[PDB]
């Protein structure tokens, strides 16, 4: 419920923008609640195979609104707890460009997508500690599996900002892209997801994001899913568009 | 002559190339089947201490060859499947020399290597997405801890092929060696592992390869390992070779 | 007492290897010696960091090889105790290396927290070479943060490697000009103990969780946020924004 | 002569080496077709850019060899002469190579303005394991690029490399999946296209400028800059500017 | 509330640009004020180094339009005289940039000795999407630093880039978090403000002489050097190493 | 007239070590000169093909020793230009094998070498501007060529010590290599030099080192030195091992 966040779907994808731009897209609980209600309905919806996720023409997000911040309750069952959950549970790719701020939610977010650009300003920042507070969204797990505990300490323990430099070496990002590029080299990229075939994909993805566990297990888990496939119709279509020397049509 | 698999031992390492030169090493059941024998013999051979996988002068492996993969009932249980757990459970080292194709099960493989090089040209991919399929060999766990979600999701989601640049970057291959020398390095890597302790280094190994755990578990789990060391004959062969200013022989 | 020196300086607890004739080689009572200081600084509510050096020209080569052959076993051992002091270490560790880091001069660097490192420090887990396995955890954290192969060229062939190899895989944040090192180091130590420390050891702590599902870590990332918005580091940290001044956690 | 196809399209001439059957080995004729299209494309008003491509899975393996062995002379010949027409050419020139890229395929590189290439590319100047020495200016351009050991590595040691060391020293822009690759190229071209030519060609000659003493420069571009504030490539930027859309450089 | 600040302090004179709310887009009297303040500062034997800084937000988004469409040329311009100046300075020049870096914010860099950024830095040199030149020398700077093709990304395709970009060819030195940028760019500062200010001067300049052949350099530096094995210098240094203090480079 | 410097030859390789092992191989004008006189000789000598540079077992050189070096009256025409020249003017290939300290000329001589490998520990510090003096060695012009100017003002300007790391990045040395086994792959790359085919190799040398000058005139000079190779030996040598499908041998 507010314009503030746009949401709408072109070729299978579900392009999902933060639009407070005045305030460098700081984030307040109807920006939340319209984020979580924009993925439940991508993640229902049949015609949507992929998520891009975008922000103004220079923010991704700078963050919580810090006045807004401050009189939380809780985190536990907030809508933002609800948003970041949706993320991290969403079953569907989910791309994003950031640009300018990604401040706390605005990186933290990030290792929850399965494809990142960003342009070259991007400045990256979890001051969580300078706000006496600890860090959400996973990230006390996600950046020392990234980054190493050291570097993800300068992030988490100094509070320290950082740049796509770091972000890209340490698996943040995928890419640099100038910024009247980045658009439009995510939504490339977001058409290429969607045009494989969904319901493998989908299974990708969720082996990926399955908690890593000892390797003959894996192979096991690998190989059940993989069975099923060796019946299915994607198989059979990329097979025969692979003879016939065409693109393959999944739908 | 041209069997499809060769094998031979040397100085302590077993040698195991794929020898289908003509269409890339693409791979079907008989060398899964013979690979698998190659790796059962080295594992109970009390001469090798080392395996070093190669390929033809111009490719590592293609990958599965389509119209045999095509036969597939299914993967579990698959002679593929068997060849794929012997090397994952190897207990004595793997190193892997890698050039021009290595896709499918040729990229997949690494992970599970000790050591890996590769030559400049080489192109590794993943293409399972492409082919309605997904990965096999653990690459949906390894890919994603080595590289991160988001760069294993160009190779395993978006199925793009990548380069050494990348494949180094991640940590899928110790470094990038001139194809006129790169079995020649491959070599000395796997000999100077084999002149090491074979029972220590295969309990490395172990350790390396142990699932990660809580931190004073896996203290207790080393120690557990290393007071066994210290009465040990490599540890007393060590010490007397620097004594006596020599290089030390663990071959006995 | 010569051989390890240790002190208190605006929160922060230097702990000084001394034994520079052997390039800090230790024997049982340096071990002794640091896991003291490390238990004494733990406990002690004037101490929020810790700082890690070595002599001025070596952190430490390793076990005194004399020392070492009268071991009866790793386990339960004084070395064990000092390894179990700083890997459970609730309070941060900061380490500035130079010269020679072997054996556990280089293990011990996973369970810090920062560690700078200068031009030209050397590091080495020779295990294998003495006929001995890694200790000190590395068997799991070398392979995290390296990955699996070139952690085996450190532990399975046994090579050292330079501060080119410890920053690209996350073992040091950073080289540093060695006569920069200790004040380098310090700076990074006091900004530190300057954030809020009640709040900073569940950061870390958090950290060093070993990984879970993902829906887990949110909540138990949430449950510890909770009680975070109910303390005085948020508050001072607010009156300090409103007020226009620099926070001051002391508090 | 098929074994060189040129067209024109969106002010981009396309030139490709069409000998796929011997990865794109050189021989006269190609050598003399190739130049023949630079001297068309060079004095072409409806080009502003050219885009060099090979196969679908080479770029080129250099000289035929049994060609090779016929020369009487590098100079003079029309090898020496293709060379001159892309190192002289006044146009921007883009190339997008892939699999072999050896000795002409490689030296050529240099005197490229944008360069993508495929994963798999294969980069060699084997002159010295031909007792003979490196053309195509790359005895200058390689040690400028890479400094003058890694260069030694490619010319004196003879040694192939890959896109790791060509991206690191600035031979090529980046790496593309093959199945992007011409169409990523393509789009850096049109890109170029779209620049007013007249002041593009400008840059490009300043560029390729030898250096010389900074004031000097200075005074060079200074000279130049100030024709530009009188032209219609400002005006039209500004105007655009203004009018709050995009710029078209065709007028 | 002046435009352009400057003010010595321990050998080092600040020079800080201060019209915030354009982002330090510069105007004739700034240029003025610029090239005032190093005039003054290469005369002034209290200042052994320059330090240029810009706002707490940006070092300078590049020349103000409407001032930039009153030029009748960049020839003899007093933007020309501030680049001159800059260019000229036989003192030594840290930058420390943030924010926009446009135009001239960023070719100026290459003068500079030693330049420190903020991880959001965005650099541009936008000339080209202007219908004009690059400036400042960058025609021949950018080529030498990045390679032909990565400097065509930036002059010919007009793209930003990034702190990446400018670490890997060498723009700057590193990449500081903000809040430690104007600090660190300090303390670089006064340590190259603590070297003796006539040997620094020589080698500068030495650095600076355009390439020769070898011989003739080594020439060249032998006699400098033979000048100082009579100075004052080397004979404070040799005394204080003697007497195990910190030299004083001020005699 | 000292074994302060060692020299010999192997297959084609003139091999020169510093051993002042004691002072980690900080220089003095006999060690200058017996070098200047190594390379001289094998300049001349026609069964050395390479040169490659060692030191001790720990350092490669400390610089210059700084008590001698306070005596000295000047740069120009002393000894140690006398040596800087020979290498700087080498037309024969030149490896080195750094490690521990590489300090002043140790350091501001890898610019002249051809390859240069260095141990993990190895400090490289270019320290003129601590001492009141300025660089030497061209380093002036080769610090910031290979490493842009404000890299190069970190080594020279501020006088910091560097690492392998930087040293690697800016071109410096060709790779890093465990100490164990550095000079077995210096001289390997040595004898693989030494395999070319003499004359060649030294008219690449020399075509590298060349300054920079206007493109078309560097094509009419490379032009003009290939077309004397169109007739050599070693071209011919080339082609006929290619046709019988045998290694070239290129020792005459």
Redesign the interface.
């Given at each position: 419920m507010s314009e503030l966040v746009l949401s709408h779907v072109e070729g299978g994808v579900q392009v999902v923008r933060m639009n407070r731009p005045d305030k460098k897209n700081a984030l307040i609980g109807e920006m939340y609640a319209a984020l979580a209600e924009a993925f439940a309905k991508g993640e229902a919806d049949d015609d949507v195979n992929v998520f891009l996720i975008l922000g103004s023409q220079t923010d991704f997000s700078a963050g919580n609104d810090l006045p807004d911040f401050?009189t939380?309750?809780?985190?536990?069952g907030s809508v933002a707890?609800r948003f970041?959950?949706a993320v991290?549970?969403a079953r569907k790719?989910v791309v994003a460009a950031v640009r300018?701020?990604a401040i706390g939610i605005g990186s933290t977010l990030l290792?929850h997508?399965?494809?990142?650009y960003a342009?070259?300003?991007?400045?990256?920042?979890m001051p969580?500690?300078?706000?006496?507070?600890?860090?959400?969204?996973?990230s006390?797990?996600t950046?020392?599996?990234?980054?190493?505990?050291?570097?993800?300490?300068?992030m988490?323990?100094?509070?320290?900002?950082?740049?796509?430099?770091?972000a890209?070496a340490?698996?943040?990002?995928?890419g640099?892209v100038?910024?009247?590029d980045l658009e439009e080299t995510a939504m490339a990229?977001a058409r290429?997801?969607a045009a494989?075939?969904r319901s493998?994909?989908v299974?990708?993805?969720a082996?990926?994001?399955?908690?890593?566990?000892?390797?003959?297990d894996?192979?096991?888990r690998?190989?059940?899913?993989?069975?099923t496939?060796?019946k299915?119709?994607?198989?059979?279509?990329?097979?025969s568009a692979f003879k016939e020397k065409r693109a393959?049509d999944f739908s």
């Open positions: 401050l939380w309750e809780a985190l536990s707890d970041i959950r991290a549970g790719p300018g701020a290792p997508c399965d494809l990142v342009a070259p300003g991007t400045r990256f920042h969580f500690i300078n706000l006496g507070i600890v860090p959400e969204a996973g006390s797990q950046m020392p599996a990234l980054a190493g505990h050291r570097r993800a300490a300068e988490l323990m100094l509070g320290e900002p950082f740049g796509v430099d770091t890209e340490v698996g943040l990002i995928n640099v100038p910024g009247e990229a290429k997801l494989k075939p493998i994909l299974q990708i993805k082996l990926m994001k399955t908690p890593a566990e000892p390797i003959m894996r192979l096991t690998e190989a059940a899913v993989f069975d496939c060796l299915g119709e994607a198989l059979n279509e990329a097979v393959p």
